[PDB]
Amino acid sequence: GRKVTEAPPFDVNSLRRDIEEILSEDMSKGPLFVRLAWHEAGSWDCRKKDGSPNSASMRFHPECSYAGNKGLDKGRNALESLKKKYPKISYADLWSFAAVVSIEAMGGPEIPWRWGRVDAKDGSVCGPDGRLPDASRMQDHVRDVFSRLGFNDEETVALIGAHTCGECHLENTGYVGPFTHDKYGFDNSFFTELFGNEWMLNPNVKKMQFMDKTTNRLMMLPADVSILLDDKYRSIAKKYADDNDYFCNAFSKAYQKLLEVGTTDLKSLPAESK
Ligand code: HEM
Ligand code: NA
Ligand code: NA
């Protein structure tokens, strides 16, 4: 084990500023980068110890063409110019970093980030499909997926609270709309809106989704509203709705863990780079 501290081969403080500038020109890329890094880690099986998480294996087939990753080409493409500018960064480090920077940019927690991920060089390391969650399914499927990733219920609910930011796109997943009225803010408001609305069927979307009664401008997936139906998940979501600092600190710990599954030999930044 034992902590290793070392300056990375790239200029992390300049890289962070370049990412922030991308976000200031196009805030929609912030939630996109958070989803990108999550899908790159979401292939993990903590039992089989496979799926090539945190390795930018999503840059290869078949993983890049799995339905759960549709739209993430826009995320990969959006970082190619920073890859060229900082050529000593791995794609895996760049994706994960861009996600932690995005979260901090949207007013979210400052999430500790370590470097050293090594990029997949071919498709042979890609694990199979059906590792990413199915939005059309409910709480048992959610628990099955998050237990396979190595998370408990408190970490599962906190991670799903990332839908505080961003929105669904019909062209990517057949789902449409934001989860909150502040989609470029990172806070507990996915839980506030979840408890604070009556969810009804949206009759105008072919894939089954909900809308809020009050405005019809929010949406929830079946997997999202399954947090209300599971007694255990509901109790945990209420704690997060009630206490944004507790939600932010739970999300920070769980998202760092996510961006580190199936990794070795990671390095802490020198206090001044972090
Ligand atoms: C039950 C588990 C989850 C399911 C079923 C799920 C499903 C989805 C779907 C279907 C979208 C819409 C994607 C699109 O059309 O562009 C989405 C967006 C998003 N998801 Fe998830 N998700 C889950 C968990 C998570 C986790 C764990 C995170 C991160 C820790 C995450 C973060 C995001 C973000 C940030 C967006 C917005 C992307 C953007 O605005 O481009 N999700 N999710
Ligand atoms: Na992967
Ligand atoms: Na929000």
Domains of the chain as residue ranges with CATH = 12-131+256-268 (1.10.520.10), 139-253 (1.10.420.10)
d(CA 75, CA 192): 28
d(CA 57, CA 80): 15
Of all ligands present, the nearest one to the C-alpha of 34 is 1
Of all ligands present, the nearest one to the C-alpha of 186 is 3
d(CA 166, CA 39): 15
Strands of the chain (E only): list them.
114-115, 167-168, 177-178, 199-201, 210-212, 219-220, 267-268
The experimental technique used to determine this model is X-ray
Angle, helix 12-25 to helix 91-105, in steps of 10 degrees: 60
Residues 268 and 114: beta-carbon distance below 8 Å: yes
Q: Structure resolution in Å?
A: 1.8
d(CA 123, CA 52): 10
Q: What are phi and psi of 55, to 5 degrees?
A: -135, 5
Binding residues for heme b: 38, 163, 167, 169, 172-173
75 lines ligand 1 (CB under 6 A): no
Q: How far is the CA of 244 from the centre of ligand 2 (A)?
A: 30
